[PDB]
Structures are given as C-alpha cells and as structure tokens.
C-alpha cells in the first residue's frame, strides 16, 4: 500500500473490511489482547487502521505503510511501524506507553 510491493498496512491477515457493529459481534466479551485489522471513516475514508480490544480499555491502533524503524540498520536498513509495536506485543504494551497491558493472543483473519 504505497509502491508496487504490498506488505505492512496490507501484510498477512491485514484486511480492513470490518466496521463498528460487525467488529463488536466477535470481540469485546472474550477479547484480552486479540489484534485484528479494522475499517475506519473519519478524515473521509480510513481503510487501514488496526484494532485490538482489551476487555477494560478497548482501544484501536494506527499502522502506516513502512514508517517506524526498529532493528540493526547498516546494510539492510529497517523501516516498519509494526516492528516497534511487535517487540511490546511480545510482552506488555503498558511498558511501551499505550495503557493496554497485553501479549499477542490470536488475529480475527477475514471475520
């Protein structure tokens, strides 16, 4: 989703065709750290926001195609907004800054 290559906002499960009531139908009663790719509309139409819900603080999360930069950056240089986030999905995102306190459970891939 920027030049002809396609992997960050649209990676493996990263779809964005799920809105407010249809995301809630398989979400916030069970959800304690499940991360899944939600359609927005606010600054016109926002197709690639990501949404994880923790049952308590239920709170969405922005992507962006390849803009974040996390890894050993000399010969192969790193540019990924998920690589900074995935380090703290390995443990607890409240030790980052966002008050979620969650590990990776399971993505809702194509509903």
């Amino acid at each position: 989703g920027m030049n002809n290559n396609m992997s960050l906002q649209d990676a493996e499960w990263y779809w964005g065709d799920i809105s407010r009531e249809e995301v809630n139908e398989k979400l916030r009663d069970t959800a304690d750290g499940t991360f899944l790719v939600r359609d927005a509309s606010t600054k016109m139409h926002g197709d690639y926001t990501l949404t994880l819900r923790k049952g308590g603080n239920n709170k969405s999360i922005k992507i962006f195609h390849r803009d974040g930069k996390y890894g050993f950056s000399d010969s192969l240089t790193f540019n990924s907004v998920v690589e900074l986030i995935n380090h703290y999905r390995n443990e607890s995102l409240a030790q980052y800054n966002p008050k979620l306190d969650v590990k990776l459970l399971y993505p809702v891939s194509k509903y």
Partner: peptide
C-alpha cells in the same frame, strides 16, 4: 471506547 484512537 470502541471506535478510533490512532496510536502507531
């Protein structure tokens, strides 16, 4: 709060 919070 189930809509939109743009974190990155």
């Amino acid at each position: 709060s189930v809509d939109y919070v743009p974190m990155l």
